[PDB]
Amino acid sequence: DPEVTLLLQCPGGGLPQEQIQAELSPAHDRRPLPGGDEAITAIWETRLKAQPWLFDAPKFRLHSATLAPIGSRGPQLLLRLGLTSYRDFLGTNWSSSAAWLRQQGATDWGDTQAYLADPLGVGAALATADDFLVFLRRSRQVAEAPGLVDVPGGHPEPQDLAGQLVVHELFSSVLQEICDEVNLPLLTLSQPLLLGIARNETSAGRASAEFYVQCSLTSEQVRKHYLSGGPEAHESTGIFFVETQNVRRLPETEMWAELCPSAKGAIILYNRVQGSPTGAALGSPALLPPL
Ligand SMILES: Fc1ccc(Cn2cnc3ccccc32)cc1
């Protein structure tokens, strides 16, 4: 799977909010482009002269993520974050010359991402009470991965001492994205666990944090809630469910070619961190069938 790379796999079956630190610093921002940020401003002006209803928004930038030694006490992960924007994204990661910016970043900074906006996305492996994961079908009319299968998620917007408020907004945002798109009540959702971080090599390496969330509703109840919003309550065009039993071998199915890279990241991390049992009982042949 060349279009996705794992940056982080979390230990302990995934990390709760209380075990993560963020460091928000202008040191973690994109570097100004070799020939000036005028190239970004020109792309944005061109785009507004065709679609004058578009608006900019701030985004978190992922710089790096350091895991503590496994089995230790205290905070288990440090996220190094800066600030970027939708405009900077459209001028760098989504530019036709994005590969040239990666090579120049390696040359100038020893960092393929130094000239890239790299806005941090969030996604969820969302499990139902009857042991299915939730999938969404993307519109065929959007710019990114048209007509492909996705999981719930988005790109959260800004507003350990500013750090703890940023970690809170990351965890809050994946629940809010589930409520907005799947039309579920907030009280049917567990506190998320961070599974890891995956990069989309089709979008010049921009990263998404992938989370596990459990819902107290069955697949049939989740479908009812999604459909009862009507066509205007969701950006997706359909919902469907796969038994967690069958998610284990999803990369061997015909579904795998229809999954967008960030959803592939969510499913690989779910299989490595929530699946793949380590103990004698769940590891026994009848419960973990060989091959
Ligand atoms: F920081 C962000 C990163 C991606 C999106 C998703 N999105 C929205 N409009 C897009 C146009 C081209 C490609 C992707 C796009 C939003 C914010």
Curated annotation (Swiss-Prot):
Q: Which reaction does it catalyse?
A: UDP-sugar + H2O = UMP + alpha-D-aldose 1-phosphate
Enzyme class of the recorded protein, top EC level? hydrolase
Q: Where is this region: Disordered?
A: 147-159
Motif Nudix box positions after renumbering to this chain: 163-184
Q: What is its EC number?
A: 3.6.1.45
Keyword set, alphabetical order:
Hydrolase, Magnesium, Metal-binding
- Molecular function as annotated in GO: GDP-mannose hydrolase activity; metal ion binding; UDP-sugar diphosphatase activity
Q: What is the effect of changing H155A?
A: Abolishes enzyme activity with UDP-galactose
State the needed cofactors, names only. Mg(2+)
Name the source's superkingdom. Eukaryota
Gene Ontology cellular component annotations, sorted alphabetically: nucleoplasm
Coiled-coil positions are none
Cross-referenced InterPro entries? NUDIX_hydrolase_dom, NUDT22/NUDT9-like
Binding-site list for substrate: F55, Y86, R138, A143, D150, H155, E157, S262
Consequence when changing E177A:
Abolishes enzyme activity with UDP-galactose
Q: The Nudix hydrolase domain covers which part of the protein? A: 117-273
The residues that the entry says bind Mg(2+) are E177, E181
Give the protein's function: Hydrolyzes UDP-glucose to glucose 1-phosphate and UMP and UDP-galactose to galactose 1-phosphate and UMP. Preferred substrate is UDP-glucose.
Return the similarity comment: Belongs to the Nudix hydrolase family.
Q: What is this protein called?
A: Uridine diphosphate glucose pyrophosphatase NUDT22
* Organism name: Homo sapiens
Q: What's the gene?
A: NUDT22
